[PDB]
Amino acid sequence: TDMWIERTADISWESDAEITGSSERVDVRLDDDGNFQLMNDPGA
Amino acid sequence: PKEYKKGDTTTGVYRIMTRGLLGSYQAGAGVMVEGVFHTLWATTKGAALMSGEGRLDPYWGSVKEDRLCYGGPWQLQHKWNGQDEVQMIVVEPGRNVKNVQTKPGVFKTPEGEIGAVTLDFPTGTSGSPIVDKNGDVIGLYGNGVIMPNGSYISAIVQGERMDEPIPAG
């Protein structure tokens, strides 16, 4: 269509944001070998 | 040509992308809860959305309240309690997602009253969810309005949960 959506984060309160005011999220997916994909990244 | 089916509705936070003349860009953000995608009316103005192997079509919206949802009725039910700080799950175009903590203010509506945040992010961030200490979505990041000093505040966009008739296939 004209537009589409891409999952970029989980929904959560983050402890580390509470402490410093701002925290980058750590939402990771792992392939078969244990390699990380960073969901939160705008280029993922 | 199998776009006769409901697309992926995994719970989470999403970027809303679209095609321009020269490539793709982020039009907004939204939140998927209970198999329903929630965003501001202004981000898509009702356009259908591809998600995974299927489609999401607009289900209900209010232009006046700047609310729009796909795949079912408005599911978000929690509201800012008026005291606690909140966290915005900031989905800024071209940036990694971050949580930002902030104290909302109550600001003077003619038609009642509304919570607003002083956080100022680009309009492509609009529709990013705002959560309370339980991770419950208390609203969406609205489009900013200008203050006397030239700074911007943004409404916490939220309304009542709406009912769905019992599903059958």
Side-chain angles (χ1 to χ4, degrees):
Chain A
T1 55
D2 327 330
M3 305 191 85
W4 68 99
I5 62 181
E6 300 178 347
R7 199 176 179 277
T8 192
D10 303 331
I11 307 168
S12 70
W13 181 269
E14 289 293 278
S15 298
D16 297 331
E18 203 173 321
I19 310 157
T20 58
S22 188
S23 191
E24 195 176 285
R25 286 190 67 88
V26 193
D27 297 328
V28 294
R29 295 308 171 223
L30 295 180
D31 67 22
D32 284 327
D33 315 307
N35 295 339
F36 281 66
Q37 197 204 349
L38 187 73
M39 195 201 174
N40 302 311
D41 193 295
Chain B
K2 310 180 180 284
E3 287 96 317
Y4 301 98
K5 70 195 211 181
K6 191 187 188 182
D8 175 9
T9 57
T10 299
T11 293
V13 187
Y14 290 70
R15 301 185 190 261
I16 299 172
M17 309 292 299
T18 185
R19 289 191 153 83
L21 174 75
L22 299 180
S24 301
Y25 63 100
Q26 174 175 327
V31 69
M32 193 81 78
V33 166
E34 289 194 67
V36 171
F37 190 62
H38 308 74
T39 187
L40 313 175
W41 178 271
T43 63
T44 66
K45 298 167 177 60
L49 305 163
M50 290 321 286
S51 183
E53 292 181 54
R55 294 167 60 90
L56 302 172
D57 287 299
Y59 189 100
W60 174 89
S62 167
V63 176
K64 177 67 154 177
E65 301 202 276
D66 207 12
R67 297 189 291 122
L68 181 66
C69 59
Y70 293 71
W74 195 262
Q75 305 287 18
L76 307 183
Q77 34 185 328
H78 298 97
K79 318 214 159 267
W80 179 45
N81 68 3
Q83 64 166 31
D84 293 344
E85 285 175 5
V86 296
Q87 280 183 12
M88 179 174 158
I89 301 173
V90 178
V91 186
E92 178 162 4
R95 303 295 210 109
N96 280 44
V97 185
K98 63 179 166 303
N99 276 45
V100 176
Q101 191 147 320
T102 198
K103 178 80 143 190
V106 193
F107 282 85
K108 292 162 148 190
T109 321
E111 203 189 325
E113 66 176 350
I114 195 160
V117 302
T118 71
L119 300 172
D120 182 349
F121 292 103
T123 165
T125 319
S126 64
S128 298
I130 296 158
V131 297
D132 69 10
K133 56 198 167 179
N134 298 324
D136 290 333
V137 175
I138 58 167
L140 305 188
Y141 182 73
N143 276 304
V145 303
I146 202 171
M147 298 303 293
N149 66 348
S151 71
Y152 273 75
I153 63 167
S154 288
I156 300 161
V157 178
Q158 177 67 304
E160 299 280 316
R161 173 174 187 95
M162 295 179 69
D163 294 321
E164 165 147 23
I166 288 156

